[PDB]
Amino acid sequence: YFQSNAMAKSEGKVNGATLMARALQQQGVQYMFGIVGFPVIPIAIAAQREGITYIGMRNEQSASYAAQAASYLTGRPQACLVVSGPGVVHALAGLANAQVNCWPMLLIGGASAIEQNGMGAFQEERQVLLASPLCKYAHQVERPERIPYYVEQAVRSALFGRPGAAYLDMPDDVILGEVEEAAVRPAATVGEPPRSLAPQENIEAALDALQSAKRPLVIVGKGMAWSRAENEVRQFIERTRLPFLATPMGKGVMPDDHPLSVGGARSHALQEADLVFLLGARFNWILHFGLPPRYSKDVRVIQLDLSAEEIGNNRQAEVALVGDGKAIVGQLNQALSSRQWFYPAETPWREAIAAKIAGNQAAVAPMIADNTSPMNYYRVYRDIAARLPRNAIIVGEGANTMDIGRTQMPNFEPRSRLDAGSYGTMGIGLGFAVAAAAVHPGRPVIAVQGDSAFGFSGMEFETAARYGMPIKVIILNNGGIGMGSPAPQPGMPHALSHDARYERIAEAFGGAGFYVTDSAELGPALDAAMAFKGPAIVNIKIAATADRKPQQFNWHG
Amino acid sequence: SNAMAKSEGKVNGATLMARALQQQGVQYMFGIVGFPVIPIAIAAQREGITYIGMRNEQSASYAAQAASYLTGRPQACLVVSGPGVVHALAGLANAQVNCWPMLLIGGASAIEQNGMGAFQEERQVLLASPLCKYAHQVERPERIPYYVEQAVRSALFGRPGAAYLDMPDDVILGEVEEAAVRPAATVGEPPRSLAPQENIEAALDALQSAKRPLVIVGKGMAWSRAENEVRQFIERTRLPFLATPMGKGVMPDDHPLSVGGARSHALQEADLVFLLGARFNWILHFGLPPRYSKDVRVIQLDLSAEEIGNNRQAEVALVGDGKAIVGQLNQALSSRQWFYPAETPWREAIAAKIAGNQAAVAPMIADNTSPMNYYRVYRDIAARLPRNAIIVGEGANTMDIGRTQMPNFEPRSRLDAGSYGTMGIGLGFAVAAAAVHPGRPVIAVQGDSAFGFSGMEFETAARYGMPIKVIILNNGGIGMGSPAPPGMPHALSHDARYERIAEAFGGAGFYVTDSAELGPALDAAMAFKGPAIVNIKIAATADRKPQQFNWHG
Amino acid sequence: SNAMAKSEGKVNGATLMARALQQQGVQYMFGIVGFPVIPIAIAAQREGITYIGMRNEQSASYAAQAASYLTGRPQACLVVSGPGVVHALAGLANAQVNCWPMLLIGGASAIEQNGMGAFQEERQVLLASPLCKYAHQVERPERIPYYVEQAVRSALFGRPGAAYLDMPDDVILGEVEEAAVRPAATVGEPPRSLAPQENIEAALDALQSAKRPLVIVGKGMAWSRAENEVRQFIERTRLPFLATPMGKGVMPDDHPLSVGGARSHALQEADLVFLLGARFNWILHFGLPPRYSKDVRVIQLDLSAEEIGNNRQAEVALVGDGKAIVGQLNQALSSRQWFYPAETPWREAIAAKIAGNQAAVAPMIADNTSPMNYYRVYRDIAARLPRNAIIVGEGANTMDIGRTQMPNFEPRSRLDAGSYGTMGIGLGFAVAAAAVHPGRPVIAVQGDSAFGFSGMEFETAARYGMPIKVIILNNGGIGMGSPAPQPGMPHALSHDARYERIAEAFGGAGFYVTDSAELGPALDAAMAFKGPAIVNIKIAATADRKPQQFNWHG
Ligand SMILES: CC1=C(CCOP(=O)(O)OP(=O)(O)O)SC(O)N1Cc1cnc(C)nc1N
Ligand SMILES: CC1=C(CCOP(=O)(O)OP(=O)(O)O)SC(O)N1Cc1cnc(C)nc1N
Ligand SMILES: CC1=C(CCOP(=O)(O)OP(=O)(O)O)SC(O)N1Cc1cnc(C)nc1N
Ligand SMILES: Nc1ncnc2c1ncn2[C@@H]1O[C@H](COP(=O)(O)OP(=O)(O)O)[C@@H](O)[C@H]1O
Ligand SMILES: Nc1ncnc2c1ncn2[C@@H]1O[C@H](COP(=O)(O)OP(=O)(O)O)[C@@H](O)[C@H]1O
Numbered sequence A: 001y002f003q004s005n006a007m008a009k010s011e012g013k014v015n016g017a018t019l020m021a022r023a024l025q026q027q028g029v030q031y032m033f034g035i036v037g038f039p040v041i042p043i044a045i046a047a048q049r050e051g052i053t054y055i056g057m058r059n060e061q062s063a064s065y066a067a068q069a070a071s072y073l074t075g076r077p078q079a080c081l082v083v084s085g086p087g088v089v090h091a092l093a094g095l096a097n098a099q100v101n102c103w104p105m106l107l108i109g110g111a112s113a114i115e116q117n118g119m120g121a122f123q124e125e126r127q128v129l130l131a132s133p134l135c136k137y138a139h140q141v142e143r144p145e146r147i148p149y150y151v152e153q154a155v156r157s158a159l160f161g162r163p164g165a166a167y168l169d170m171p172d173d174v175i176l177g178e179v180e181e182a183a184v185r186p187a188a189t190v191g192e193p194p195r196s197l198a199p200q201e202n203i204e205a206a207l208d209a210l211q212s213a214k215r216p217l218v219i220v221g222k223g224m225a226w227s228r229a230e231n232e233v234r235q236f237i238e239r240t241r242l243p244f245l246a247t248p249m250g251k252g253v254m255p256d257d258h259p260l261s262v263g264g265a266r267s268h269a270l271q272e273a274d275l276v277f278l279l280g281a282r283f284n285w286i287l288h289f290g291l292p293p294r295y296s297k298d299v300r301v302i303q304l305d306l307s308a309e310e311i312g313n314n315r316q317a318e319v320a321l322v323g324d325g326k327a328i329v330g331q332l333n334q335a336l337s338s339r340q341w342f343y344p345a346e347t348p349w350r351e352a353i354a355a356k357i358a359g360n361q362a363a364v365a366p367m368i369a370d371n372t373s374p375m376n377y378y379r380v381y382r383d384i385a386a387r388l389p390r391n392a393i394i395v396g397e398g399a400n401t402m403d404i405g406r407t408q409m410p411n412f413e414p415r416s417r418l419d420a421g422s423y424g425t426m427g428i429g430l431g432f433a434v435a436a437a438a439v440h441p442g443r444p445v446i447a448v449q450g451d452s453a454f455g456f457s458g459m460e461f462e463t464a465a466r467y468g469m470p471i472k473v474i475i476l477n478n479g480g481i482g483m484g485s486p487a488p489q490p491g492m493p494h495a496l497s498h499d500a501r502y503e504r505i506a507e508a509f510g511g512a513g514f515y516v517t518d519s520a521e522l523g524p525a526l527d528a529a530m531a532f533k534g535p536a537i538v539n540i541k542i543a544a545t546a547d548r549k550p551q552q553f554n555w556h557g
Numbered sequence B: 001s002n003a004m005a006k007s008e009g010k011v012n013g014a015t016l017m018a019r020a021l022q023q024q025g026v027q028y029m030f031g032i033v034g035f036p037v038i039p040i041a042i043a044a045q046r047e048g049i050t051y052i053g054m055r056n057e058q059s060a061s062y063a064a065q066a067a068s069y070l071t072g073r074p075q076a077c078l079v080v081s082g083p084g085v086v087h088a089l090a091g092l093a094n095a096q097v098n099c100w101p102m103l104l105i106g107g108a109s110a111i112e113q114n115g116m117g118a119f120q121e122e123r124q125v126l127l128a129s130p131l132c133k134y135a136h137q138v139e140r141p142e143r144i145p146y147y148v149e150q151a152v153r154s155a156l157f158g159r160p161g162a163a164y165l166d167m168p169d170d171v172i173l174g175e176v177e178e179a180a181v182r183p184a185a186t187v188g189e190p191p192r193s194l195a196p197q198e199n200i201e202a203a204l205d206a207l208q209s210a211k212r213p214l215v216i217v218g219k220g221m222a223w224s225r226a227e228n229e230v231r232q233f234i235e236r237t238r239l240p241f242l243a244t245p246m247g248k249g250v251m252p253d254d255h256p257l258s259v260g261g262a263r264s265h266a267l268q269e270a271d272l273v274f275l276l277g278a279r280f281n282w283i284l285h286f287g288l289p290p291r292y293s294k295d296v297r298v299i300q301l302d303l304s305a306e307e308i309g310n311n312r313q314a315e316v317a318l319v320g321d322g323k324a325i326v327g328q329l330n331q332a333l334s335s336r337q338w339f340y341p342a343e344t345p346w347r348e349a350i351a352a353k354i355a356g357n358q359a360a361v362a363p364m365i366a367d368n369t370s371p372m373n374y375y376r377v378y379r380d381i382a383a384r385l386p387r388n389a390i391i392v393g394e395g396a397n398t399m400d401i402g403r404t405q406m407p408n409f410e411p412r413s414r415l416d417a418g419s420y421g422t423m424g425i426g427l428g429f430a431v432a433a434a435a436v437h438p439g440r441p442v443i444a445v446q447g448d449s450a451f452g453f454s455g456m457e458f459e460t461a462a463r464y465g466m467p468i469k470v471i472i473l474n475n476g477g478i479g480m481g482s483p484a485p486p487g488m489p490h491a492l493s494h495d496a497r498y499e500r501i502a503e504a505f506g507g508a509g510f511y512v513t514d515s516a517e518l519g520p521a522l523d524a525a526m527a528f529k530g531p532a533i534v535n536i537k538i539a540a541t542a543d544r545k546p547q548q549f550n551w552h553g
Numbered sequence C: 001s002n003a004m005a006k007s008e009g010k011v012n013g014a015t016l017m018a019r020a021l022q023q024q025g026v027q028y029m030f031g032i033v034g035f036p037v038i039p040i041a042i043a044a045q046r047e048g049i050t051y052i053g054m055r056n057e058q059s060a061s062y063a064a065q066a067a068s069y070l071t072g073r074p075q076a077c078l079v080v081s082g083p084g085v086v087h088a089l090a091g092l093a094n095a096q097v098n099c100w101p102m103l104l105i106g107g108a109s110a111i112e113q114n115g116m117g118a119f120q121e122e123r124q125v126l127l128a129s130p131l132c133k134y135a136h137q138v139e140r141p142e143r144i145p146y147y148v149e150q151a152v153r154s155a156l157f158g159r160p161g162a163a164y165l166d167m168p169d170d171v172i173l174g175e176v177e178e179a180a181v182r183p184a185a186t187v188g189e190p191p192r193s194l195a196p197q198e199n200i201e202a203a204l205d206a207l208q209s210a211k212r213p214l215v216i217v218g219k220g221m222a223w224s225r226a227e228n229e230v231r232q233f234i235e236r237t238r239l240p241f242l243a244t245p246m247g248k249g250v251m252p253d254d255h256p257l258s259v260g261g262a263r264s265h266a267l268q269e270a271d272l273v274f275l276l277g278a279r280f281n282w283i284l285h286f287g288l289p290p291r292y293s294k295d296v297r298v299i300q301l302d303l304s305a306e307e308i309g310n311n312r313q314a315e316v317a318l319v320g321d322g323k324a325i326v327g328q329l330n331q332a333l334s335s336r337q338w339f340y341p342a343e344t345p346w347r348e349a350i351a352a353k354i355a356g357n358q359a360a361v362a363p364m365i366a367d368n369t370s371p372m373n374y375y376r377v378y379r380d381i382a383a384r385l386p387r388n389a390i391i392v393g394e395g396a397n398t399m400d401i402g403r404t405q406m407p408n409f410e411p412r413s414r415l416d417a418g419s420y421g422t423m424g425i426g427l428g429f430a431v432a433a434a435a436v437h438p439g440r441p442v443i444a445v446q447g448d449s450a451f452g453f454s455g456m457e458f459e460t461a462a463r464y465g466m467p468i469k470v471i472i473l474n475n476g477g478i479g480m481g482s483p484a485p486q487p488g489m490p491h492a493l494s495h496d497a498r499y500e501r502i503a504e505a506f507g508g509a510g511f512y513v514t515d516s517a518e519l520g521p522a523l524d525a526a527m528a529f530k531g532p533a534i535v536n537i538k539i540a541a542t543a544d545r546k547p548q549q550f551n552w553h554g
């Protein structure tokens, strides 16, 4: 028909796709990243009918990574939408990554029709089984009338407690099945994650422990960024005058330019601290397990975590603070108003930290200042860091490209750096940047990737161009994974294409491409890329043997 | 000979495991020995751990979680490779559903033989993982202190659950240098957390506003060891309360504020419910019609934030430890005058429904005619229940009627089929209670079908001098009897002489068919210094009192 | 009243399930009823299926796979949701390891309550899947014929194994129109495959060239119903053979060509081994040193291609059905004159070691001391075992010594702990053998520990009038007795236990034996008693098996 409003239309019935779209919108899902196909086309269409922003990606890998980044950036679970069978299996990448990083996510996976189960149906798969080991919550929606219930429970399970991934299986007959409107049971709106507080004796014992320590170190993790505790943490550091270290994605909770940051003397600080205060940060590989040879064997630990089971992993916790980061630091701030202790302005600990920071700055100064071409990493970031706005979102991915950018690119706002994370994952790059451009379109999004990392997700540049996302992709091409290689005899397994013109990919989709080989070219290329009104790629050819500055300890062992 | 030089520099995995378990507070180990866990049980006893050898790993895995509940620390179930671990999956699943801690130590075939078809080779970690909070294989003996500490912590901290350690034969017998073994920290008490002060005040204001309030006291408060705080809270507020099946005893059952005798009316008519460590699962009928008002307001105290607002939204969420939060509530109550008034229409309706149900079952309690009904039988059982006894209840009618006729006056003093509705926990639970609290009498009241699942464990009780008192209510079938016959699927043996099983292992056996025999038989069984079975032949068609709603649907 | 108008156009899930099960040849259902499977058991009886109500789901699941092995068709285990299913995982795992078919039907909570914390809500398909060849939830009652057909076929065809059907409560009670239900085909006999002719001929070439050949008869041949072909093959080739524990009976244990009494020498010295439906797992010592020559040539017949060449490479592979391939071997041998010669140095060495092992246990067999040793006990047992009896053996010393002292003359007549070394199969296996073959005697010989795992199923045998004869060898411990305790030893049990009184609790006959003079009259009264019976024998605490060069495990 031409949908003449004069025709009688029954409004009693509603299908599972529409019920799913309404339940999602009610639960605060604003962004849905995916790829359509059988049987989830009606879901994405109904989502747009309710005002949800649908972002069609180029691979389910990037879609599942984008949804957890968007969840991290908004504070509520956002959705990944994938087709049955291989759609879900490609999306297991996001679930595993979200599980390891304690980020929420909602994977909506279509399934083949229930009535054809056992028959070898198109894309028939045991989807709940496969997803369950990676999920905090996984279930199949068996009938469309239960959809509000299942969406409510899946969002609550992903968001409350230690966050994780939720998976909802949607069979075809459920997506298309219809039920009476009045017969659909309502579901309550999931609110904010419940915050819990620590007992008072633990709050006072924490402050008691801090006073006794000669060389105390506060470690700020991305659990404080997730808890939205930046104000409380900045008040605590300002009030106590304690030295602090930020984790990779903990950067920005405290501003990177804060004078109390031991960032430039990280190895010395971990080695010589007699007491560590863990704020939303695990003693996993990223903090070298809290054990020798990176820490003192007798290091005392105050540990603030939402997960009671994490307390005392690897290295025992003297003072355990189990609860919400924002709430517990608020408790600490209120107890410090009854006390008057602060960490003194002049101690040997402060002197050793300042001297080591200056030594590390003096060690990288010649590399930052060296204008020879092909350029090293520190020289390239000199021009990048000079042009990064104070409110930018930075996505970093690679090995040397990522690790050197971690120290050369400051963050001043929390939740403004997205990188390989606790799983050390390549492939999150353009997925994370697309999520950052959809969640905060008023802020510049700059992705700085190595040449290898770009190849995992570089095709999502089309997605950015398709939705008018002015994402700035900067590629540091040394021609290999972690390091370049000469022309050979077969090629090295770590070898790629040092002469690749990755910037031409931008021209395929209507973006701007720039190619940098000499130091004099870098400045004008970056300025034009930031000023170009759309997505851009800047492909920088760096020295094949460029490396990070030498450290006493390898980052891994 | 002590004059012979003997190298003391090395220690094997079985000894490291026993030392690590003793350090983390494991005092009881239930299992069945065999390849390759024999040295583990031997090493455990040398460290002072009490080892109890059962007759089936099913009962062993149930005993381990029962003792964990009673002691407040994870206790051990030790089983052999292959079918040992698969037999023990029953207990892991039950522990997961009840949120009880548990440490299963499972032997495994030697790692050097993986893929060859070794004796009892199995993917044991993979099988157990979906039923556990924690599951891992110990790959090298030097890691044992680390893994024992992490498993005990994972099972005990937060929402408790099952932890599993896979112990290959080469790790059990593998030796390492004693000085090279890295020590682990001792897992302390479970961390407690509190609610925000705003939430404490919102909870108290909501209690003041309600016209028909009801406190529901769950076994989570028994696990939290929060009985003192709960009794102060109920005594301070004068609020009516309902105890869940194993929440019984947190408040004494004879307390004047209990709505136990008017449970259906209390849930149906309340306008506000205060859930204390209780879930809106099937046991509480999901907090939804037809058993509740569609507009019921909910204050929900739970340690798990993901459980908040399941099935029925919570108006006030109190996320944290039960004892700590009720402690906060008691403190905030010390600055208010409010208490629930002594005279309200809500109290009078509760009292009239209690008196109604009492008159309904009074003729069955007093009826001395034989074959007896359930209420007449429990009239003599209840009269001889010591107040410090640990009561194990198991069956359908036998358990459900025992739940109302057998009061508890202390917490953690009733063990029953639980949140999983499990038959087969009876003697395993009773064995665990007798090992943990040998100074307390242990009475298991089972139906005749329930006794069939684990009845062989009576030999375990006798072998260890555990004076467990097993009382069997024998109607001749599952849930109900049946006339003489193919036989009905639910039918069993109405004439079975189960008490003769006691006489097979030195216990005392008593057979009762008449009401005049019940009193003297219970007294002779209670007095006997050893285990005892009282087999009672009840009426085939005896049943529970009529109700408006079926317990399930 | 039949005069009342009754609508007969609808049928529910439990009835569809019963008709589907009976259509697919399910004759026996072992379970324990309760929510939500009560209608399924009642419906099964209406279609003539024999329902046996057990006392624990553990035994129920072991019973179902034993009946599948004896009947050649998957039989049912029926369990309630939640812990019923979790208790039955033991049988699935044991059926998987032994390659025996089995159909587990598990009730489930109603689908419409999923996620709510319903009574006995559980991820039952997820838990059972690693142990099953086939595991699915029946989502709608109209699908029941389809799923039953697919599950029985998946459990029975190819390498057999367990199948699991999850039956939610709203599917059990749900109704469908009679004429709307889609029919399902009847699963027939398992497909048999043959070997290429060049493999048949090369296998025969290998046999001729061997100086010390050995044929190993495994329970794969028993499951394939290949006893006729195997007997014709050993009789035609005159080859020495060794039967596995449950391969016993495929060839009569009294055949002159059995090397059973010289087992270690036959494996150690054979230059060529012909595996007939037997794996080189722990039971055959992996086919490797120190139990075999390092250069041992292997011919391997197995239905599973992936099994071929495990641990020890096979010189000739025969992938197919046991009955079918041995038929090819017998056919090809009719165009050959070769047979293994009547007199060989290999034959004399086998004879000598048998004679030496016979003389090694002969004094223990004849020793009339009380407390008795194991061999003395079995002298009276074996002298009273009917030739058509079904033997169930379970324990450590009790089972291993019963293996050599109780011959089997027919196949599929011995049921024991199997490839998984499982305790707890005893009375479930005996109940299944009594239900399936009620005209045949069923004798279960268990140790004291093993009887404690399933002893309560004696009430099941008494309730269904199954004349199972339970002989318990009580040494007062697990594998060995123990002196009185000071904490009791972990392996210790009750040497003075009167296990036979359990029989008197359920109407059976109980007998107690301590002296050797009492053993004879007690066994004769137990066999003559018209019903189940327990013979409790207090054996010596330190009695052990014949000394061997190698330990059974390592
Ligand atoms: C390839 C790879 C990297 C690229 C370094 O090369 P790239 O050009 O991106 O940066 P460079 O160091 O400046 O050369 S890192 C890394 O861990 N990894 C292994 C790796 C591969 N795949 C996935 C999913 N996660 C990974 N973690
Ligand atoms: C058999 C069985 C019961 C016995 C009632 O019969 P019993 O004689 O013990 O008590 P009665 O009511 O006085 O006659 S209850 C029940 O749920 N059930 C099913 C059931 C079976 N197996 C497992 C593991 N869990 C279960 N839950
Ligand atoms: C207890 C036990 C056995 C009894 C030997 O003692 P029993 O009195 O039955 O026989 P005895 O040797 O004549 O004294 S064997 C064994 O492997 N095992 C460990 C064992 C335990 N649990 C399971 C499920 N499977 C097992 N396999
Ligand atoms: N609201 C919250 N309050 C406190 N801690 C939290 C909260 N949410 C998550 N966490 C914890 O923060 C920790 C983050 O650790 P990790 O991912 O290792 O951070 P990083 O990698 O920055 O060190 C997790 O262990 C998680 O349990
Ligand atoms: N220390 C604690 N404080 C408060 N609640 C707890 C604690 N430990 C466990 N819980 C919670 O108590 C609840 C027990 O509820 P449930 O087992 O349903 O009780 P019942 O069976 O008596 O209704 C679980 O949801 C669990 O998360």
Ligand SMILES: Nc1ncnc2c1ncn2[C@@H]1O[C@H](COP(=O)(O)OP(=O)(O)O)[C@@H](O)[C@H]1O
Pocket (backbone or CB within 6 Å): C097, C098, C099, C158, C159, C160, C217, C218, C219, C220, C221, C223, C224, C244, C245, C246, C247, C277, C278, C279, C280, C281, C283, C284, C301, C302, C303, C304, C307, C320, C321, C322, C323, C419
């Ligand atoms: N019809 C059949 N024909 C041939 N082999 C079969 C058949 N069915 C099963 N099998 C095989 O028989 C083998 C049984 O070996 P196993 O259980 O090790 O027996 P045993 O313990 O007697 O050695 C399995 O590998 C299985 O694949």
Ligand SMILES: [Mg+2]
Pocket (backbone or CB within 6 Å): A450, A451, A452, A476, A477, A478, A479, A480, A481, A482, A483, A484
């Ligand atoms: Mg590179």
Ligand SMILES: [Mg+2]
Pocket (backbone or CB within 6 Å): B447, B448, B449, B473, B474, B475, B476, B477, B478, B479, B480
């Ligand atoms: Mg009964």
Ligand SMILES: [Mg+2]
Pocket (backbone or CB within 6 Å): C447, C448, C449, C473, C474, C475, C476, C477, C478, C479, C480
């Ligand atoms: Mg024994």
